[PDB]
Design a protein around this ligand. Structure first.
Ligand SMILES: Nc1ncnc2[nH]cnc12
Ligand SMILES: Nc1ncnc2[nH]cnc12
Lengths: 283, 287, 291
């Protein structure tokens, strides 16, 4: 059976749970419940009161806690800034790629220090998300009558907002500061679609844990490559986030049902075997 | 009332900008500053100087306690920080002996304490996401440029002037730095990639200094010195550049003192508060 | 004093190489901690040589946790003047095919969190501020010795500066090349791979930096021979990199790497290095900004 963790009326809440992990405590307690008959657990990435900044989030504990609770999938959300004209505030992005600019975060479960699992794990990350789970997020958006924009098969002038972009690349910066204009334009020239602070190493550790992970990013701003009145700040992010979170909730809850309506035996076994085959110390 | 802090880089390890009236041997909640802070006056404008690398230049860029240096200057009541940095050029018109009043940067540093705020017990509580689109105090940048004009140094602004007005040595009116972690210099491969990205100079010390100054509600501006048989000529050129930057700094302090900064300082403090994500969540009863 | 002694740092596929008969096995410590493993001393011909596996005996130390400082300092303390190093890597360019080698001459550094200098202001480092030039970061004489060693072992050499593309005959040793060194342990995304390719980098690896930098800080002549084991992940899904792909290709190429390394040690031994060693030491002293 499947069980979907969510990192961030139609959700039946059962109770709240405190867990510990080999890598420390998660960001907060976890809300356990059900969507129809599918078990679901919800974890706030930045803790109660949003007091934990992106660089200090215990990604290892959060992903491992969901694994230890039996999660087979993780669906994740984050706010983000758009680097490109056709991704506008109020849009969503089902990411398929990233460029990592984070540092100083614990980004793997394995190593040679006592606080990590024994071994050397070199995971392939060419296409770093679970593709089946990406397509479920996109289909959930269709089921909730939210427009879907596929730049491979459509083009500008077919882009109807607010829309879910069917693909996109994120640069993840370490934070806590936002980017300079110089950095924003450099990331844009690299062809990246959005900028955020929390995707990495969350996505990497989910694959190390044998979990199917997909992210849907909420565009809250144009970073700072446009006009001065459109340069990102916290108030701007929060104002748009508050307008978009109801759509993102509808997508996520619809996707949990769609996951539970399919068989995942082979995908799960594939996930686990990918971890085993990536052990350099064992091979 | 204003008080100008000065962080002197290479060439300023033992600055003699004014007669020492007093010294402050202090620590901060974030550890020890690079050296004793030296107090005095430029005219009737109060000034505080500290050498980024300490006397004797014993502290490398990645080990400088940027948090403690900014905090210590804030603790003494500084409203402004003027900083110097010796840099290498990435573009043909930035020539050794030139200066740059930076307005942009690309950050390639890591492993440095770059914020006062967070969830660690020794951090200030709260989550601060500061805007950095234009990361310097613009009023203070223009003071540095005006100080150079007032001391008879060429100023070149590529936005309004053809490359024929680029007369060396000159202060470039704008420019971007890539800040690398050091201590090693860049490979040729790295230098050419930075050049292809359009960056003007390379240094090791701008970040997180500029970021922490904004977190502290201070007006910060930086003046870079472009520094690169020839070694003897490079060194003498650098000495002349340091004499020029000394003139610019002293004139800039006087120019800052000649104006009212009440509203700018209030805006500096208001920007910090508006960047507190944890407080803005609360103002709307979020979650 | 004109005595030469060649250290060898063995990467993946070199966890236990038989380059020579062991004379001494050295368990040492350094001011920067323990090296990756014991150091094996011996002779190749008349040339003294020291071998160290980068990842330890059972390949238990990931790239980001290797004590590069201790490895380089231990070799220096045993009297090495030179370090020859191997690394497995992925290709970012069509003319660099699995089974080729690359005598690197450039790099782009994307590592973090590693101790990358012997010098600093804290008690656990040597006293001083050392700013080493790195524009051409390898020892050029030692690079050319690796390239000559391949010629002497009848292994094709392809020099893009002087030869036409038609003279790129595989398997070959590329006479120049740039590496991007990523921190690991994960491999790159397709997005990252295409960005690195667009910057013009030739290969991707995890272990060159800070090893090459610390060697120069130590006054040692360092050169690297990279073994192409894969096309990273910018090509078809059947050529996307993974551990098994890396190991399988390496087993095939290790034989020729050993021949190059042993011939290179002999070629170093056949020349006088007095002025180059003096210049290596003088570059360290002139890069001290506290003095
Ligand atoms: N512009 C931006 N940069 C980084 N993280 C963000 N989160 C929301 N907007 C962002
Ligand atoms: N593609 C690759 N990336 C990083 N390190 C590697 N080692 C071998 N192949 C590699």
């Amino acid at each position: 059976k499947v069980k979907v963790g969510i990192i961030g009326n139609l959700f039946k809440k059962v109770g709240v749970r405190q867990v510990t992990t080999p890598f420390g405590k998660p960001s907060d307690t976890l809300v356990e419940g059900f969507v129809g008959d599918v078990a679901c657990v919800v974890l706030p990435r930045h803790g109660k009161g949003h007091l934990i900044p992106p660089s200090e989030v215990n990604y290892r504990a959060n992903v491992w806690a969901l694994k230890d609770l039996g999660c087979t999938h993780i669906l994740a959300t984050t706010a983000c800034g758009s680097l490109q004209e056709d991704l506008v505030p109020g849009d969503f992005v089902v990411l398929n790629q990233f460029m990592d600019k984070t540092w100083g975060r614990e980004n793997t479960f394995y190593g040679s220090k006592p606080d990590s699992l024994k071994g050397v794990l070199h995971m392939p990350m060419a296409e770093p998300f679970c593709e089946r789970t990406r397509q479920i997020l996109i289909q959930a958006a269709r089921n909730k009558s939210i427009n879907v924009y596929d730049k491979k098969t459509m083009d500008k002038s077919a882009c109807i907002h607010p829309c879910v972009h069917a693909e996109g690349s994120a640069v993840t910066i370490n934070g806590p500061r936002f980017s300079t204009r110089c950095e924003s334009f450099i990331h844009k020239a690299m062809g990246l679609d959005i900028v955020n602070m929390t995707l990495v190493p969350e996505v990497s550790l989910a694959r190390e844990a044998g979990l199917s992970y997909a992210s849907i990013a909420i565009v809250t701003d144009f970073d700072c490559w446009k006009s001065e009145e459109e340069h990102v700040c916290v108030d701007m992010v929060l104002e748009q986030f508050r307008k978009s979170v109801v759509h993102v909730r509808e997508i996520l809850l619809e996707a949990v049902a769609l996951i539970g309506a399919e068989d995942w035996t082979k995908t799960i076994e594939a996930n686990k075997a990918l971890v085993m085959s990536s052990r350099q110390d064992l091979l």
